[PDB]
Amino acid sequence: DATFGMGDRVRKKSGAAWQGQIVGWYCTNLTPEGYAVESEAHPGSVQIYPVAALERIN
Amino acid sequence: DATFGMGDRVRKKSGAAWQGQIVGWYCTNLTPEGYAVESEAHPGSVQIYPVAALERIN
Amino acid sequence: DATFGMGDRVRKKSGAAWQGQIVGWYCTNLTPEGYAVESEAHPGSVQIYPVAALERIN
Amino acid sequence: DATFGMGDRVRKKSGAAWQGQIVGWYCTNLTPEGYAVESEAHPGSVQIYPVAALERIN
């Protein structure tokens, strides 16, 4: 089912950079599999992205 | 356990406004219970907030 | 020079929806002409987008 | 007038962390003096904050 799990280390594949740990998930019609990622550089800051935008590292 | 569930209609209590449906969740040390909310006015747009920032309506 | 000015009413062209007034601007190498847009539905909430993502309405 | 200028290195004072360069500005009734900050750790990623949330470093 889910591509990533809580605590996986991921980064953005392209475009704006982001890297850190999976800390949650979301699901919309536009993004049926999305993840919340907490920056490893900026503790407490979280961004949300579609699964296609992310890759696991490690 | 969780204050809200998927599909609950919520709004921001104060400050910047946001209103729509719960579409996910996240957990960080700064925000141990956070929610993703898809705007009911702006389909596909999602913002994330701590539970203390949100209230259920309906 | 700038495509939009302060107070222009704009919306996202595609994808996640957003609509409201231009309230600022930003410039990065990835987004050399970006705008801050305050939602007309959700006062106080602001999102930032590249100019190519937005169109003026109205 | 403005507290910061383009290219100033700033960080969040408290709460969620963010650090990098001023790349824009915004103005709303809730945030009459706001700044866009591009992360120095995550090139291309930009977050917006009220001036009270930021301090100049460096």
UniProtKB/Swiss-Prot annotation, chains A, B, C, D:
- Quote the record's miscellaneous comment: Type II plasmid-specified enzyme is practically insensitive to trimethoprim and methotrexate.
Where in the full protein does the shown chain start and end, and how long is the full protein? Answer: 21 to 78 of 78
Effect of changing residue 49 to F: reported as: Decreases affinity for dihydrofolate about 9-fold. Decreases affinity for NADPH about 22-fold
According to the UniProt entry, the note on domains is: The active site is situated at the inner surface of a pore formed by the four subunits.
Binding residue positions for substrate? 48
Which amino acid positions bind NADP(+), per UniProt? 12-16, 46-49
Per the UniProt record, which EC number(s) apply here? 1.5.1.3
Part of which pathway? Cofactor biosynthesis; tetrahydrofolate biosynthesis; 5,6,7,8-tetrahydrofolate from 7,8-dihydrofolate: step 1/1
Q: Which GO terms describe its biological process?
A: one-carbon metabolic process; response to antibiotic; response to methotrexate; response to xenobiotic stimulus; tetrahydrofolate biosynthetic process
Q: What does this protein do?
A: Key enzyme in folate metabolism. Catalyzes an essential reaction for de novo glycine and purine synthesis, and for DNA precursor synthesis.
Molecular function terms, GO-annotated: dihydrofolate reductase activity
The answer to keyword NADP applying to this record is yes
For this protein, what reaction is catalysed?
(6S)-5,6,7,8-tetrahydrofolate + NADP(+) = 7,8-dihydrofolate + NADPH + H(+)
What keywords appear on the UniProt entry?
Antibiotic resistance, Methotrexate resistance, NADP, One-carbon metabolism, Oxidoreductase, Plasmid, Trimethoprim resistance
What's this protein's name? Dihydrofolate reductase type 2
Q: How does it assemble?
A: Homotetramer.
